[PDB]
Amino acid sequence: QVRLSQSGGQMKKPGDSMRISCRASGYEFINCPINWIRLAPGKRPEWMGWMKPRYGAVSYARQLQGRVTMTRDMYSETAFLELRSLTSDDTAVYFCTRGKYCTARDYYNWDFEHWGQGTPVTVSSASTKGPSVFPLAPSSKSTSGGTAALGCLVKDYFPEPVTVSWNSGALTSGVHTFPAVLQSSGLYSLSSVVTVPSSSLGTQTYICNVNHKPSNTKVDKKVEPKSC
Amino acid sequence: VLTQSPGTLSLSPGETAIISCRTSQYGSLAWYQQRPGQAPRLVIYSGSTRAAGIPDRFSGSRWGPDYNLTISNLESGDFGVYYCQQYEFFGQGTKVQVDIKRTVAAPSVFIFPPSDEQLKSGTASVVCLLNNFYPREAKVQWKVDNALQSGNSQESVTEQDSKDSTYSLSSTLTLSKADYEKHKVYACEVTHQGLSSPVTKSFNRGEC
Amino acid sequence: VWKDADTTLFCASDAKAHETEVHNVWATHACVPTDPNPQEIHLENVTENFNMWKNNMVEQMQEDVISLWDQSLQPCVKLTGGSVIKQACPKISFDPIPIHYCTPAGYVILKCNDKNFNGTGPCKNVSSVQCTHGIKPVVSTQLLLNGSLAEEEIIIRSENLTNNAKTIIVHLNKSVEINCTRPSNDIRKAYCEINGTKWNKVLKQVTEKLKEHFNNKTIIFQPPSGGDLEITMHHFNCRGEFFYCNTTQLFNNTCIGKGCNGTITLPCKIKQIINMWQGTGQAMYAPPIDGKINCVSNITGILLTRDGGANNTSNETFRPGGGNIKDNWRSELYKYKVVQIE
Ligand SMILES: *[C@@H]1O[C@H](CO)[C@@H](O)[C@H](O)[C@H]1NC(C)=O
Ligand SMILES: *[C@@H]1O[C@H](CO)[C@@H](O)[C@H](O)[C@H]1NC(C)=O
Ligand SMILES: *[C@@H]1O[C@H](CO)[C@@H](O)[C@H](O)[C@H]1NC(C)=O
Ligand SMILES: *[C@@H]1O[C@H](CO)[C@@H](O)[C@H](O)[C@H]1NC(C)=O
Ligand SMILES: *[C@@H]1O[C@H](CO)[C@@H](O)[C@H](O)[C@H]1NC(C)=O
Ligand SMILES: *[C@@H]1O[C@H](CO)[C@@H](O)[C@H](O)[C@H]1NC(C)=O
Numbered sequence: 001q002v003r004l005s006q007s008g009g010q011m012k013k014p015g016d017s018m019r020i021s022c023r024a025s026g027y028e029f030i031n032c033p034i035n036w037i038r039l040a041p042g043k044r045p046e047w048m049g050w051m052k053p054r055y056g057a058v059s060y061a062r063q064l065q066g067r068v069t070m071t072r073d074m075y076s077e078t079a080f081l082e083l084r085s086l087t088s089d090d091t092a093v094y095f096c097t098r099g100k101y102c103t104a105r106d107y108y109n110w111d112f113e114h115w116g117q118g119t120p121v122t123v124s125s126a127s128t129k130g131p132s133v134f135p136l137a138p139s140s141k142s143t144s145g146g147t148a149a150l151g152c153l154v155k156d157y158f159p160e161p162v163t164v165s166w167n168s169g170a171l172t173s174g175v176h177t178f179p180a181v182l183q184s185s186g187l188y189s190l191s192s193v194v195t196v197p198s199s200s201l202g203t204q205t206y207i208c209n210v211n212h213k214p215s216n217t218k219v220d221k222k223v224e225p226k227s228c
Numbered sequence: 229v230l231t232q233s234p235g236t237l238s239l240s241p242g243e244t245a246i247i248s249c250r251t252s253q254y255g256s257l258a259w260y261q262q263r264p265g266q267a268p269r270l271v272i273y274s275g276s277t278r279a280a281g282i283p284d285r286f287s288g289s290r291w292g293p294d295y296n297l298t299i300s301n302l303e304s305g306d307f308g309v310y311y312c313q314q315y316e317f318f319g320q321g322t323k324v325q326v327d328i329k330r331t332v333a334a335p336s337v338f339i340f341p342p343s344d345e346q347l348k349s350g351t352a353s354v355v356c357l358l359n360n361f362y363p364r365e366a367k368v369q370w371k372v373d374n375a376l377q378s379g380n381s382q383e384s385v386t387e388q389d390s391k392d393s394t395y396s397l398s399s400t401l402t403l404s405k406a407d408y409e410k411h412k413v414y415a416c417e418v419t420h421q422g423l424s425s426p427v428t429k430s431f432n433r434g435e436c
Numbered sequence: 437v438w439k440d441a442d443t444t445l446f447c448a449s450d451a452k453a454h455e456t457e458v459h460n461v462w463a464t465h466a467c468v469p470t471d472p473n474p475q476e477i478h479l480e481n482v483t484e485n486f487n488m489w490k491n492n493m494v495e496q497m498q499e500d501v502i503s504l505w506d507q508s509l510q511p512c513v514k515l516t517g518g519s520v521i522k523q524a525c526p527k528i529s530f531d532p533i534p535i536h537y538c539t540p541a542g543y544v545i546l547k548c549n550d551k552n553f554n555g556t557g558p559c560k561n562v563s564s565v566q567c568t569h570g571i572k573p574v575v576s577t578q579l580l581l582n583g584s585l586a587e588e589e590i591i592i593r594s595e596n597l598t599n600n601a602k603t604i605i606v607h608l609n610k611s612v613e614i615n616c617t618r619p620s621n622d623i624r625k626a627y628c629e630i631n632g633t634k635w636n637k638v639l640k641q642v643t644e645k646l647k648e649h650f651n652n653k654t655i656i657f658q659p660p661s662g663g664d665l666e667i668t669m670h671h672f673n674c675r676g677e678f679f680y681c682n683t684t685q686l687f688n689n690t691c692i693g694k695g696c697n698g699t700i701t702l703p704c705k706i707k708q709i710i711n712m713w714q715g716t717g718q719a720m721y722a723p724p725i726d727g728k729i730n731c732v733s734n735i736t737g738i739l740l741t742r743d744g745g746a747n748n749t750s751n752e753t754f755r756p757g758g759g760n761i762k763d764n765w766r767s768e769l770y771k772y773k774v775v776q777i778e
């Protein structure tokens with residue numbers, strides 16, 4: 001039975017180098033190539049390159065030329081991956097793979113039947129930044145028989161996560177806190193909203209409580225209708 | 229070179245998933261399944277050949293450059309992300325997630341101008357909320373002085389609500405303070421099965 | 437009526453009994469004398485499909501060359517499987533001779549005679565023969581040496597050009613000499629001389645042929661991306677000594693775009709600790725012999741790999757390949773296939 005076993009996950013900073021291994025067994029190691037594929041949530045899986053144990057022949061994806069090195073140890077039947085100059089875009093789960101068809105005479109590299117269990121690698125700055133919390137105000141005229149929407153926009157923090165509660169958790173009904181998005185700036189943002197009876201806008205006070213543990217930040221923001 | 233569609237399928241157990249991949253080149257096409265927190269698994273290779281262990285509910289077809297993976301009678305183990313592959317090239321992936329059926333519900337639409345507090349920062353964020361709707365499929369388009377906007381918005385969607393089985397979505401339009409003050413009318417247009425026509429919520433910048 | 441089949445071929449040669457040369461001695465015990473009057477029957481109105489990349493003649497030649505090297509080029513030390521084997525390693529006489537492969541009774545070899553045949557697909561002029569031409573079992577990487585030349589144009593060979601995992605064989609129609617030398621009185625230092633005028637013209641023609649197969653994209657050469665010395669350098673055996681020559685200068689993109697004309701001298705070194713192409717492990721040999729070590733060869737082919745990746749660039753990058761010695765035999769056996777008569 002063919003098996004591929006990979007080294008454990010690791011956390012890196014920008015600029016660092018990473019090294020992972022993949023130990024193969026259950027077949028003749030030199031008969032077929034080993035590939036490296038990285039999966040990042042939301043992105044297409046990316047082929048990094050293959051390596052043929054025979055003489056350690058390699059082929060690297062063009063876009064990774066100069067940053068990547070694939071080697072192997074013949075005795076321990078182990079393949080190795082090194083990736084230099086890490087950035088946030090390198091955050092991914094890394095797999096080694098081998099084709100389904102592999103004999104002593106012939107192979108087809110690309111039908112990946114065999115995958116290692118995967119090696120998660122996170123590449124992030126050690127710096128932290130607290131959220132900016134802006135209100136999302138209801139409306140102008142209070143309709144006595146309708147429902148109003150309000151919330152607060154939680155912008156430009158790093159890293160994940162932030163959590164939001166309302167009135168210190170007293171208000172839960174109709175609350176939607178959205179999954180964060182990663183902005184072009186490299187910083188995260190999310191929105192938290194809640195629907196409430198429009199008749200309570202002049203009576204009830206609505207505070208969103210924002211928590212961001214990495215920056216040790218807790219901020220309360222009162223969301224009220226704009227005066228005009 | 230590999231165009232996989234759609235991005236997301238929201239289906240109930242028992243239904244059938246239809247996933248398609250358009251190619252432009254020559255070679256055998258494979259399909260992979262990635263279950264949550266697991267390594268990808270070879271499902272199909274060479275267009276329609278089922279890998280070992282794969283039940284016949286999975287089947288691959290091909291018409292011209294269009295390859296299709298159809299999964300009949302969906303089970304729990306079938307949900308996850310699917311990828312087509314040709315040589316070193318992979319599709320963007322299709323997320324097949326569990327959807328619980330309910331009646332059609334139109335979204336309540338709300339638009340939020342940028343805060344005055346934020347406008348001090350030099351940036352402006354306009355938020356559009358689509359609240360409590362079903363099914364998941366919804367289109368949001370931003371218009372600024374009746375001009376279609378592209379590349380300056382991001383959306384986020386909630387997981388299906390465990391109580392009323394609805395979804396909610398927020399779209400954020402981000403502009404610079406200078407670019408924001410250049411225009412007057414800001415609108416988000418919402419199209420959804422529960423609306424007889426697309427609904428537009430808007431405000432005129434400045435006036436309250 | 438015949439069908440494609442495989443069998444146990446026998447070998448023929450012109451090995452001499454008085455020669456102490458290694459290949460000769462092997463062929464003396466393993467082969468029969470060649471036929472002075474070989475017969476070739478040209479088949480009319482006969483179209484046959486060939487596939488050089490799935491030709492089992494190649495598998496048998498591989499077995500023979502391994503057996504030859506194993507029975508001759510015995511290392512002082514054989515480092516394999518964690519264990520250490522110490523044998524006697526005397527200096528030998530080494531010079532590959534032509535070897536013919538032939539079919540037994542009931543089987544015949546079909547030979548493709550299309551001048552522009554690329555290795556796979558149908559063939560119009562087909563002939564019938566009992567034996568192949570004389571093939572020298574030259575073991576090398578990056579460059580094919582002392583082989584046959586293409587008839588008409590330069591021929592690009594690959595099981596599938598769209599597949600970056602598949603080796604590319606460039607078959608030249610004009611040989612270019614390479615003159616390697618280890619002068620007498622660092623004893624392990626050597627060099628190869630190549631006429632830069634002939635090579636750069638040939639190399640230019642190679643890029644133009646590749647343009648035809650890659651939509652007129654910019655064709656760029658690069659040194660290997662990594663691997664053992666046997667493949668990152670031009671590896672070959674001359675007079676029993678293992679040579680490792682650096683080929684960075686042989687693939688000068690500047691000289692195929694002034695001043696590059698002249699004589700190219702590649703830095704070579706004779707190693708004693710080598711990785712065996714038999715897929716075994718490491719072998720340790722004696723220090724090089726004294727005197728002038730020299731051998732002149734014909735570059736008749738080039739082994740290339742093509743870069744891949746999720747890109748959109750308008751240039752294709754090629755790098756000197758090799759390491760799979762079975763490919764060396766494919767480059768000569770490409771026009772032959774074994775069939776069985778009923
Ligand atoms: C080239 O590869 C395709 C699949 O990638 C295969 O179907 C075809 O037979 C190959 N061609 C040759 C000549 O081997
Ligand atoms: C193939 O056919 C032509 C025409 O009969 C002949 O002249 C040519 O020599 C043949 N090719 C070979 C290699 O014999
Ligand atoms: C060789 O010729 C066959 C038959 O026309 C063709 O299918 C194949 O693509 C060619 N291969 C190369 C490498 O040109
Ligand atoms: C080398 O090439 C020349 C012509 O360029 C040829 O005459 C000679 O026989 C070749 N040597 C070999 C094949 O050993
Ligand atoms: C070799 O082939 C090339 C085409 O790739 C051609 O330009 C050249 O004239 C040929 N050499 C000959 C016929 O000697
Ligand atoms: C090969 O080069 C050496 C010097 O490096 C020279 O003496 C010899 O004559 C050359 N051989 C040929 C055939 O040109």
Ligand SMILES: *[C@@H]1O[C@H](CO)[C@@H](O)[C@H](O)[C@H]1NC(C)=O
Binds near residue numbers: 699
């Ligand atoms: C290289 O070969 C050319 C013929 O192609 C010849 O005229 C020239 O003299 C050679 N160069 C040297 C330095 O010998």
Ligand SMILES: *[C@@H]1O[C@H](CO)[C@@H](O)[C@H](O)[C@H]1NC(C)=O
Binds near residue numbers: 668669682683
């Ligand atoms: C080959 O020679 C070039 C000459 O500058 C050198 O830079 C390169 O490192 C050499 N390659 C190897 C594998 O030693």
Ligand SMILES: *[C@@H]1O[C@H](CO)[C@@H](O)[C@H](O)[C@H]1NC(C)=O
Binds near residue numbers: 684685691694695696
């Ligand atoms: C290519 O030739 C130029 C000009 O002779 C030279 O400067 C350069 O080093 C050469 N490139 C190599 C040897 O890779």
Ligand SMILES: *[C@@H]1O[C@H](CO)[C@@H](O)[C@H](O)[C@H]1NC(C)=O
Binds near residue numbers: 582731
């Ligand atoms: C090629 O053949 C010539 C004689 O035909 C010989 O001197 C030379 O050593 C051979 N080259 C190799 C690498 O065997």
